[PDB]
Every structure is written in structure tokens, then in C-alpha cells.
Amino acid sequence: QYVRIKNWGSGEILHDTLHHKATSDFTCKSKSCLGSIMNPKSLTRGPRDKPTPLEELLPHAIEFINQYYGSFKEAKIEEHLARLEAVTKEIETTGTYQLTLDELIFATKMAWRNAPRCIGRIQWSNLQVFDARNCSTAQEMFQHICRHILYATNNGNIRSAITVFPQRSDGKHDFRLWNSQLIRYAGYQMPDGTIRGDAATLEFTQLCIDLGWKPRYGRFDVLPLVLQADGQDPEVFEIPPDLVLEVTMEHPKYEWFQELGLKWYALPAVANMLLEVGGLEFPACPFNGWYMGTEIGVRDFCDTQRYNILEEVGRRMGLETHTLASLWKDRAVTEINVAVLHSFQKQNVTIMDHHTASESFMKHMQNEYRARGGCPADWIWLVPPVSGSITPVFHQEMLNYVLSPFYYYQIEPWKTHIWQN
Amino acid sequence: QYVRIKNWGSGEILHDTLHHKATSDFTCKSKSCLGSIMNPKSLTRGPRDKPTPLEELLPHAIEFINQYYGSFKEAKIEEHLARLEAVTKEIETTGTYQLTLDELIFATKMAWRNAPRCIGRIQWSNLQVFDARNCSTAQEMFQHICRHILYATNNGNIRSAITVFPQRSDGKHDFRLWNSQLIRYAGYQMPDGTIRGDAATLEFTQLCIDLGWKPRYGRFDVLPLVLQADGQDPEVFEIPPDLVLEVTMEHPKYEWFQELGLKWYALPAVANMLLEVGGLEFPACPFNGWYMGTEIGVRDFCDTQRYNILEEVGRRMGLETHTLASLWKDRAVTEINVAVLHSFQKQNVTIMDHHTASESFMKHMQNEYRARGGCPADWIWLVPPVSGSITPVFHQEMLNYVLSPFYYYQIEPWKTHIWQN
Ligand code: HEM
Ligand code: HEM
Ligand SMILES: C[C@H](O)[C@H](O)[C@H]1CNc2nc(N)[nH]c(=O)c2N1
Ligand SMILES: C[C@H](O)[C@H](O)[C@H]1CNc2nc(N)[nH]c(=O)c2N1
Ligand SMILES: C[C@H]1CN=C(N)c2sccc2O1
Ligand SMILES: C[C@H]1CN=C(N)c2sccc2O1
């Protein structure tokens, strides 16, 4: 009937029934739980080489159409009925179908709404949609992407948006962005064995170089867009610097913080995910929202596998960086977090601290259960990387399941791509 | 063959094969993951009212005996063979069997070793075992428990230990401790609607009162032991104050911290879990290790559902406690954590900071894969309540599964108990 969920901080109880609409199997076994696996197959939608079998499509298509028309406050049965037939006939005549712009907008917001790992979902209905399903070349992709970046950046007053390119037809003509995020920094393997820049993009950086991109060997060099159109080999494109807004890091008290010469891009945009909707798959649909402080101040700056700046900030604070039990790491990471938030605020760039985001998510989840008795949520991703139990999200039991529409991961394109030259 | 596991901080890869020895089903469904549910049925072993069917026992018994004898560095086949027969004959003749003291010690350490939610498992082989399987009355239980508390406290130089009482025979004569932990503080519902003390023990406190315990209405009143022997109604017993070691909270800089009049018990001991081993179940086996700072400084003191002292510490620090985005909560919780660690250190009471515990666990897991290619681990419990990604445990993917021996939870005794008077 329903799974009981409790919030140990408040004692509140919730009944989850939405999980019944869950698609096929998830990650965890029957006698084993994964949960903490970053890229499980349950969240990945791979490549094809043949259209989607009609027996599978039509059911999903009908299903989606029913969900779409069901969403209206005042039903439109004829329109619904009409759409149902038109869709069917279209599938019979073309072996696939096209969504109406409104259905697409609906699909993008719902898929966002269904992202178990997104803590900013209270904003789900507030999303701008750029329809690029007519795109056909790498150059056109590049223009669309630039328009997106410009619209979304909005001189610091960030706006959430998504650009949808042509849906996968037969899997042999996929539109794909080879980047992780639209704007990412390069990571170089220096001569003296050290790593410069974002160690996380090392392989992809090399790939950009192996494709003719000129490495500037900086600590913060914006990587180029590596676009793939209609299944063809990817083409490299530098992002016009005017479009990339950055925030210089300053601490509100430690004047020496700037001496660290740190900065970060203001636009967080996922570039390589696939949008699944009504039997259709969109291998290219870069989207963006805005940053939550800890992503930058904690992960990007303090992960040892990233810019790893924690110890240095410790020393400059004159802490016992050689005695773990002194909790210096705890002292440092906080100042860095304050730096990030301070810097974004002073430069008028949208950002949200993790405490506020958590409360926001709790209100959202709360609304979701009333609205549809459920909210797919991955505790492991929703709980901020610092101050865990200090946030309300930590005390909330959650159910993680994959609905549809959905945003899946994809096999790295360079691992399955059939090159031409 | 094996599940691949990656540590994103180091890049290291591990192959888990131990999960194959997993018992029956776990929590997560096939198309849904729980993971974040505190008390799932997969971790609970309920009450019975009839002996364990022999078809189920013998197999488990043989299994355990094989694991035990297999653990020796130099095999003792005859002894193994002999034990196998003796065990069998014992089951045939009595419908159950008794473990040798050595097998029991082995079982308690292995079950600890198999606790997915324990971050201090590197200490697993270092455990003192008090054999109370001969106990028969509440008073005897009380003596054993007192001996345990005294041995374990060791004037602040904490020692891990466990006391095992009679195994469940037919489920109608269970030995059970009704407390959560051996030493826990009382929680009272005051006249003026406020809550005093540990809000988490409110119900159990009332229960102690409904059983004749005299409420001292303090903020830190040690609850009484509510012992149940051989299936009889529980009897109340106050713990001799001499046995309860406490640490007064002092901050190494904020002299006003003491003015908060805070303190905590030095002995963390789980009182209500069940030890499952070779088909046998021990409904009473209180055990203890030592504290990890964050349990006290973050959970006990800062959980809103506990002593909820965060805002007050904020104010005394003169922080913008009305602006979440100021990260004041982050500033406060750190000082409290330093207080706890400082206080335990100055009073010579064993304690481990969370950063050190995490590294320790990583070394342990690392050893476990070499030793037996696996380590059941519940990411959600192993990652400290603060400084998440600052700890190595955060970047470690993990597999959570239930082996045997194991420590299960149990239905609250007062919900299934058949009273007599
Ligand atoms: C408006 C503000 C938004 C905020 C503050 C927000 C915040 C976040 C954060 C903190 C993460 C964690 C990222 C990481 O640790 O790697 C995340 C993940 C995610 N967000 Fe949101 N988000 C927002 C908008 C959006 C939008 C507009 C979409 C889609 C239309 C979206 C889709 C997702 C998805 C699918 C993930 C998972 C990414 C992955 O698995 O790598 N988010 N979000
Ligand atoms: C020697 C030091 C030890 C340390 C520092 C340690 C630390 C911890 C911590 C921090 C937790 C989390 C508790 C919570 O958040 O509620 C935990 C849980 C646990 N520990 Fe360990 N532990 C130690 C020894 C032991 C021993 C000796 C046993 C058993 C023989 C054990 C069994 C467990 C179990 C079963 C849990 C789960 C408790 C639950 O689910 O409520 N631990 N431990
Ligand atoms: C192993 C771990 O699953 C990965 O380390 C986790 C935890 N949660 C995360 N949470 C977010 N929000 N983003 C993340 O990168 C990761 N990684
Ligand atoms: C919902 C959540 O499962 C409970 O809040 C969690 C997370 N992890 C925990 N981790 C530990 N170590 N002890 C805990 O109490 C809890 N509770
Ligand atoms: C960097 C990456 C993850 N963090 C975010 N805030 C978001 S929200 C949408 C996209 C996105 O991109
Ligand atoms: C309070 C409870 C949980 N925290 C601990 N450190 C441990 S370790 C063994 C028992 C125990 O008791």
C-alpha cells in the first residue's frame, strides 16, 4: 500500500505511495544495498544502434501523454483523446514521434522534479526551455549553447534553463556534448609531476588537446565545448570569454585570502546527461540552475582530488595543521565557505548557502507528499558535504526510486564513439 | 563474481566478493532503495514463542562451527571434526546447543566486525567478553552489568567489552535490557510544556516512572537499569553513581562555556541489541567501546530533538544567529566539538575525534578487503555528522550487507512483553 517514512528531527511521518510508479529495477540487490555507488547502471541510459522497438515505445508514449494531460487543473479530454490518436498514428507512420513544445517543457520540469540527487527541486517549475530539436550541425549547437550560457548567466542574476537538441533516432546519429559541464576548468599534468588546475578534468583535458585545443596551462583555464552533432565526430569550440562570468574569492576578514588568487565560474551546468521521456531519449540537453556554496567551497576547493587547498588555508590561519584532533580542517573549511558566499554576494552573483538549501528542500519534499505522496530522494546526495546533522535533511528518511521523465547519466561518449577520421 | 568498488578520493579500486556470503534479503527492494531508514526489518530480529526449528538450526550451527575452526592459522581438523559431531549430538539430544567460551568470544568479535554501522571496527579483535550465560535473576544481571560498567570505565581509560547473558531458548524466557544504553540521561516533560534533559528518552523515562523509579527532574539524571530475566517482568535498579564517570564540558578559550553547565557520561554502551550466531540468538548482550567526539558534540548536544544547545552557544559567541547564510551554526558546532574533545582530554577520558576515526576506518576497510575481500559498510552511518567530504570515508563507495554473526535490533520489549502483574 505505502512505505512509512519518518523525520527523526520532527517526529513527522509521511506515507510514500509514489514509489509504485517506479520504473524497472533500481541499484540495490535483494540481499545487498549499494546506495553509495556514484554511477550505478540504474541511473545510466546507454547508446543504441537501432530505433526503439515499437512495442516498448507506444506504451511509454501513451503513458507520458496521459501524465501530461492529467497535469492540467481543468481537463481537456478531447484534446487528450486527439493527442493520443495523433501520437499513435505518428508512431505508426514514422516509427517514432515528436513532442509538442508544451509537452517538452512539461517533460523537462518533471524530469528535474524527479531527480533524486537534486536539492534545489523546490524551483522545479521555474525553468526556461530552449528548443533546439531543429539543430543539425556542430556550429548550430555552439550557437545554441552560447545563447543558453548568456541567458542563464544574466550578468550574475542566474536563471535556470535547459536546451534540448534532436532526440536520438537510431542511436547512430546522436547529438552529444563531451563535456561534464558547460563551463569547467582544465586540469594539466605538469612536467614536475604536479597537477595544475582541476585534476578532475585531466583525461577530458588531454582529449581536448588530442583534438587540437591549445592548452594555456593555467590554474583556471575554461575548457572548450566539444560538440557532436547528428552522430558525427566531435568538433572543438572555445567559449567566448565575455560569456563566462567568474567570481574572485575574497574573505570578509582575512585580506590574505585573495592572495590565494582563487575564483570560480558562476554558472553550474550539467552537459552530458540524457533526458528520457515517453519512450523518447534526448542524449543532449545541457541544463543549469545556480550554485550551492558547499559545491565550490567544500568539494571543488577542498576535495583532495580537486584544488585541494585546505592545508594552505589552515597555515594562513595559523592552525595546528599537524594535529587532526585540533579540528583545524573544520576551522578552515568554514572560512573558505564564508569566503565563497561572501565573494558571490559582493559580486552580485546568485548563490545559496547549504543551510538555506536544506530547509528549502524540506519544504519541497513536504509539498511533494501532499501533491503526489512521494519524492524520490537520494539521502547520500541531498545531505550537504559539511554540517550534516546541522541540516534538517539529515534527519529525514528517504526513498530513492527512478520515475519518468528522468535525467540519466550516459557512457562517456569517447568510449563508444565510432570515429570516422 | 564480484562487485567493483571505487574510492573517488584516491582512485583506488576494490573487489568485493564477501557479499556473496550475505544471508537472506536486505532492506532495499528491486526497484527501490531505502538505505536511509533507521530501523528497517532487515536489521531487526524479533521475538519467538517456540524453539528454533531444527532444520534451520543445524545448518547454521554447522556453518558457524566451520567458520570458527576455519579462523585458526593452523588447522585442527580432528578438533573441528569432533566439535562438529558433539554439536550435532547436542542438538539432537537437547534441541539446541552451547558455544564454547572461545567460540563465543570469536562470535562477539566477528559480529562486531560485521556491524555495517560501526566506524571503530579497526578495534574489533580487541574485546573483553564477560560470560553471564549462567545468570538467572534480575539481581544477578544487575551485578554483571555493574561489573561490566566498572571494568569498561576503567577510571577513564576505556576498554571495549561485552556481557553475554543466557541465549533465547523458546522466546518465552528472554533476558532483555529495556534501556537503549547502559548509561543514558532521563528526559522529563515539565509543567510549563518544556522538556528537560534528554528529550530522546521521554517515553522510556516515563516507563521507568511507571515502574516505580523516582524522577529527580534534573537535566542530567542517569536513568535506572530496567532488567528482565528469564522472561519475567522487568525490575528497576539504580546505577551506583560511583560507577558512572562523567566529563564536565569546558572550552579551551571561552571560559563562559562551563557556565552552560554541560557534561556527558564517558561510557557509550548499547544495551538492547541481539547477538545472532550459529542459529543461536542472545537477546541480551550489552557492549561498549569508546566515544567519537561528534556523537556528543554534534548529535547529543546539537540535534534539535536532543539537548538542542546550538543557538545558545551561537549567542554567547555573539554570532548572527538570525541569518543562516552567515554560517553561524557552522561556527558554533565546531567550538562545541572542540569543547567536548578538550574536556575529555583534560579529564583523561578516552575519546576519538571524527577525522582520526575516519582515517582509522579506511585503514580497517583496506585491511578487510585484503583479509577477506569485503567489509559490510553503511555509508550513511559511517560518514560523521559534520565535515562529511573533509573525511576520507565520504569518498569511499561501500556495500552494505548482513553477514553472521551479527548484531540486530529488537522490537521494543514493552511492546511485545506479556506482563504477569
Ligand atoms: C535552481 C537551483 C538549483 C540548485 C541550487 C541545485 C543544486 C544542486 C546541487 C547542490 C547538486 C549537487 C551537485 C554535485 O554535488 O555534483 C544538484 C544535482 C542535480 N541537479 Fe540540481 N539544482 C538546481 C537546479 C537544477 C535544475 C534546473 C535541474 C534540471 C533541469 C537540476 C538537476 C539536477 C540533477 C539531475 C542533479 C544530479 C547531477 C549528477 O548526478 O551529477 N538542478 N543540484
Ligand atoms: C572501540 C571503539 C569504538 C568506537 C569509537 C565506535 C564508534 C561507533 C560510532 C560513532 C557509532 C555510531 C553511533 C550512533 O551514531 O548512534 C557506532 C555504532 C555501532 N557500533 Fe561501534 N564503536 C566502537 C566499538 C564498538 C564495539 C566494541 C562494538 C561491539 C562489540 C560496536 C558495535 C557497534 C554497532 C552494532 C553499532 C550500531 C549501533 C546502532 O545501530 O545503534 N562498536 N560505533
Ligand atoms: C561515495 C560517494 O557516493 C560520492 O562520494 C558521494 C556522496 N554524495 C555526493 N553528494 C553530492 N551531492 N555530490 C556528490 O558528489 C557525492 N558523492
Ligand atoms: C535518516 C538518518 O538515516 C538517521 O538520520 C541517520 C544518518 N546516519 C546516522 N549516522 C549515525 N552514525 N548515527 C545516526 O544516528 C544516524 N541517523
Ligand atoms: C555543476 C552542476 C552541479 N551543481 C549545480 N548547482 C547544478 S544545478 C543544474 C546544473 C548544475 O551543474
Ligand atoms: C552510545 C552507543 C553508540 N556510540 C558508541 N561509541 C558505542 S561503541 C559501542 C557501544 C556504543 O554505544
A33–B26 CB contact, under 8 Å = yes
Is the domain of A30 the same as that of A70? Answer: yes
Characterise A59 by phi-psi region: left (phi > 0), alpha (psi -120 to 50), beta (else): alpha
CB A208 within 8 A of CB A226: yes
Distance between terminal CA atoms of chain B? Answer: 56
Is the domain of A51 the same as that of A155? Answer: no
User: What's the CA-to-centroid distance between B109 and ligand 4, angstroms?
Assistant: 23
Output the CA torsion sign for A185, A190, A196, A201.
Answer: positive
- Which residue's CA is minimally distant from atom 8 of ligand 5? A289
The angle subtended at Cα A156 by Cα B323 and Cα A255, nearest 5°, is 60
Is the domain of B314 the same as that of B350? Answer: yes
Measured distance CA(A204)–CA(A54) in Å, rounded:
36
Output the CA torsion sign for B235, B240, B244, B250.
Answer: positive
Q: Is B327 contained in some domain? A: yes
Omega before A51 cis (within 30°)? no
Is the domain of A124 the same as that of A18? Answer: yes
How many CB atoms sit inside 10 A of residue B419's CB?
Answer: 8
Q: Over B57-112, what HEC string results?
A: HHHHHHHHHHHHHHCCCCCCHHHHHHHHHHHHHHHHHHCCCCCCHHHHHHHHHHHH
Is the domain of A128 the same as that of A140? Answer: no
Is the domain of A74 the same as that of A196? Answer: no
Question: Which resolution in angstroms does this entry have?
Answer: 2.4
**Nearest CA among B387, B375, B43 for reference residue A36:** B375
What atom of ligand 5 comes closest to residue A290's alpha carbon? 6
CB A350 within 8 A of CB A158: yes
Method of determination is X-ray
**Nearest CA among A322, A276, A339, A267 for reference residue A64:** A276
Q: In whole angstroms, how far apart are CA B124 and each of A105, A147, B112?
A: 55, 58, 6
Q: Could you give phi then psi for residue B246, rounded to 5 degrees?
A: -125, 160
The angle subtended at Cα A394 by Cα B312 and Cα A180, nearest 5°, is 125
**Nearest CA among B306, B328, B309 for reference residue B317:** B328
Indicate the number of domains in chain B.
Answer: 3
Instruction: Say if residue B173 is exposed, middle or buried (CB neighbours under 10 Å; 0-12, 13-18, 19+).
Output: middle
In A214-370, beta strands by DSSP E: 225-228, 235-237, 246-248, 263-265, 269-270, 274-277, 280-282, 287-288
- CB-side exposure of B11: number of CA atoms within 13 Å? 5
CB B67 within 8 A of CB B284: no
**Nearest CA among B288, B34, B280 for reference residue B184:** B288
Q: Which of B12, B90, B140, B295 is catalytic?
A: B295
Q: Is A32 contained in some domain? A: yes
How many CB atoms sit inside 10 A of residue A419's CB?
Answer: 8
In three-state secondary structure terms, A342 is: helix
Q: In whole angstroms, how far apart are CA B327 and each of A51, A294, B320, B322, B330?
A: 52, 11, 9, 10, 5
Domain span at B220:
134-159+174-245+409-413
Q: Is B118 contained in some domain? A: yes
- CB-side exposure of B285: number of CA atoms within 13 Å? 31
Residue B269, strand partner residues: B288
Measured distance CA(B139)–CA(B334) in Å, rounded:
43
Q: In whole angstroms, how far apart are CA A57 and each of A54, A63, A91, A278, A285?
A: 5, 10, 8, 7, 20
Type of residue numbered A1: Q
In B250-364, beta strands by DSSP E: 263-265, 269-270, 274-277, 280-282, 287-288
CA dihedral (A14, A15, A18, A20) in degrees, to 10, reads 140
In A124-164, beta strands by DSSP E: 128-131, 161-164
Is the domain of A143 the same as that of A213? Answer: yes
DSSP state string for A41-60? GGGB----SSPPPHHHHHHH
* B338 contacts in chain A (CB < 8 Å): 327
CATH number, position A192: 3.90.440.10
Instruction: Say if residue A1 is exposed, middle or buried (CB neighbours under 10 Å; 0-12, 13-18, 19+).
Output: exposed
What atom of ligand 4 comes closest to residue A398's alpha carbon? 1
Q: Which helix (H) or strand (E) holds B3?
A: strand B3-6
Q: Is B76 contained in some domain? A: yes
Q: Could you give phi then psi for residue A61, rounded to 5 degrees?
A: -60, -50
Type of residue numbered B278: G
Q: Is B146 contained in some domain? A: yes
A225-228 and A235-237 strand pairing: antiparallel
User: What's the CA-to-centroid distance between A351 and ligand 1, angstroms?
Assistant: 13
Is the domain of A376 the same as that of A334? Answer: no
Measured distance CA(A369)–CA(A367) in Å, rounded:
6
In three-state secondary structure terms, A222 is: strand
Is the domain of B63 the same as that of B87? Answer: yes
Q: Is B119 contained in some domain? A: yes
B269-270 and B280-282 strand pairing: unpaired
Measured distance CA(B315)–CA(A338) in Å, rounded:
19
Q: Could you give phi then psi for residue A254, rounded to 5 degrees?
A: -80, 90
Between helix A310-317 and helix A328-346 the angle, nearest 10°, is 100
Type of residue numbered A312: E
Between helix B101-113 and helix B54-70 the angle, nearest 10°, is 90
Measured distance CA(A8)–CA(A323) in Å, rounded:
34
Q: Is B190 contained in some domain? A: yes
| Separation in Å, CA of B381 to nearest CA in chain A | 11
CB A273 within 8 A of CB A283: no
Type of residue numbered B256: W
Is the domain of B202 the same as that of B348? Answer: no
In B110-250, beta strands by DSSP E: 128-131, 161-164, 176-177, 187-189, 195-197, 225-228, 235-237, 246-248
- Binding residues of B for Zn(2+) are 28, 33
DSSP state string for B230-246? TTPPPEEE---GGG--E
Measured distance CA(A369)–CA(A196) in Å, rounded:
46
A380–B379 CB contact, under 8 Å = yes
Residue A277, strand partner residues: A280
Measured distance CA(A394)–CA(B405) in Å, rounded:
30
Residue A281, strand partner residues: A276
Is the domain of A110 the same as that of A18? Answer: yes
Pocket test for ligand 6, best of B123, B160, B179, B181 (most atoms within 8 A of CB): B181
Measured distance CA(B410)–CA(B273) in Å, rounded:
6
**Nearest CA among A270, A290, A320, A287 for reference residue A109:** A287
CATH number, position A329: 3.90.1230.10
* Per-residue burial over B333-351, b = 16 or more CB atoms within 10 Å of its CB, e = otherwise: bbbbbbbbbbbbeebebbb
Q: Is A392 contained in some domain? A: no
CATH number, position A88: 3.90.340.10
Is the domain of B203 the same as that of B70? Answer: no
Between helix B77-94 and helix B54-70 the angle, nearest 10°, is 160
B399–A26 CB contact, under 8 Å = no
**Nearest CA among B177, B263, B158, B295 for reference residue B228:** B177
Interacting residues of B176 by C-beta distance below 8 A, sequence separation 6+? B227, B228, B234, B272, B283, B284, B410, B413
